[PDB]
Amino acid sequence: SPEERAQLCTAAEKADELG
C-alpha cells in the first residue's frame, strides 16, 4: 500500500518536524 505509506510518511515526517 504505497499510498498508505505516503500518507503515514507525512505524519511521521511532520511529527518529526514538530519534535
Ligand X SMILES: *Cc1cccc(C*)c1
Residues in contact with its own copies by CB under 8 A are 1-2, 4-5, 8-9, 11-13, 15-16, 18-19
Q: Minimum distance from CB of 14 to ligand X (Å)?
A: 10
12 binds ligand X, rule: CB under 6 A: yes
7 binds ligand X, rule: CB under 6 A: no
How many angstroms separate the CA atoms of 4 and 19, rounded? 23
Q: Tell me which DSSP letter residue 1 carries.
A: -
Q: Minimum distance from CB of 15 to ligand X (Å)?
A: 10
How many angstroms separate the CA atoms of 13 and 6, rounded? 10
